[PDB]
């Protein structure tokens, strides 16, 4: 490994994603294959490319060293194996969705999805999301309200 | 209110205008 001069970058970089981010998910990759990463990188791909991460770090000692910053709801995620996912642009989006759909294709556990932060809380798969731009679901709420 | 006076603007408008707006149209009614 590297000394501190390097354990600091994995911090100053990874914590300015939290400081400058959008949504957060969860997942434990016990059996995390590489067809695994391959896929989810195309997903990050659709979800821009390299706007997304997953930098395995669940050393509390790392991606909690980014938490007493923001998201101290994660002192509780960080135990055991974890795969932290941050969003920069994009809706508070679909990121959420396929992690459940992925891991529900066996694709290993999902930490039961211990969940995360947009609010400041816990678990439950939501597509309360990428409807986003479904302001059309407030366009159809126009003419249909005007007519009916 | 005037329905045409709220269609001419309600088909043509910006973006982030809406993004910090229709996370809340859901609130007054629904």
């Amino acid at each position: 490994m590297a000394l501190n001069l390097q354990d600091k970058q994995a911090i100053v970089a990874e914590v300015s994603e939290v400081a400058k981010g959008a949504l957060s998910a969860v997942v434990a990759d016990s059996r995390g294959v590489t067809v695994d990463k391959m896929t989810e990188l195309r997903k990050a791909g659709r979800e821009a490319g390299v706007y997304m991460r997953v930098v395995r770090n669940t050393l509390l000692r790392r991606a909690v060293e980014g938490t007493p910053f923001e998201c101290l709801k994660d002192a509780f995620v960080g135990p055991t194996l974890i795969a932290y996912s941050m969003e920069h642009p994009g809706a508070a989006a679909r990121l959420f969705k396929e992690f459940a759909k992925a891991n529900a294709k066996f694709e290993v556990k999902a930490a039961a999805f211990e969940g995360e932060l947009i609010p400041a809380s816990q678990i439950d798969r939501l597509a309360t999301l990428p409807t986003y731009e479904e302001a059309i679901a407030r366009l159809m709420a126009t003419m249909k309200e005007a007519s009916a | 209110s005037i329905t045409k006076d709220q269609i001419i603007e309600a088909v043509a408008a910006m973006s982030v205008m809406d993004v910090v707006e229709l996370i809340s149209a859901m609130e007054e009614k629904f």
Partner: protein, 141 residues
Amino acid sequence: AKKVQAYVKLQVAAGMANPSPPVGPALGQQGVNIMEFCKAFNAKTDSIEKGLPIPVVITVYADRSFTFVTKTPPAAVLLKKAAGIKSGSGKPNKDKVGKISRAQLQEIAQTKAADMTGADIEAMTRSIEGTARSMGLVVED
């Protein structure tokens, strides 16, 4: 495909799917049907092009028949009909012999867009650097 089971790839040919000395039998003999790669392959052959290198995988269990898959061409080979020289040395690579087309390497690599990890299609280029410094043949960039 979320589960591999059987795959042997021995670059075939399009214009007539009916070999015998190169592959022929050895392409289908363990629950595989020699009768159906001339019924099925050529059904996915003529839409594109014919004659040149075709690696391939098939869907044979022990289920009599099957369904054929397609693939992609080798990448250092698109430096033959897609560059110049067709060997790679002549003076063993104690001598840096080859010679490149910088324009090519991107769009000629890009032709292999469906089988690479780089998000940045420029990245997919940077891979072809070493794939094309495979001898030490410098590119006139």
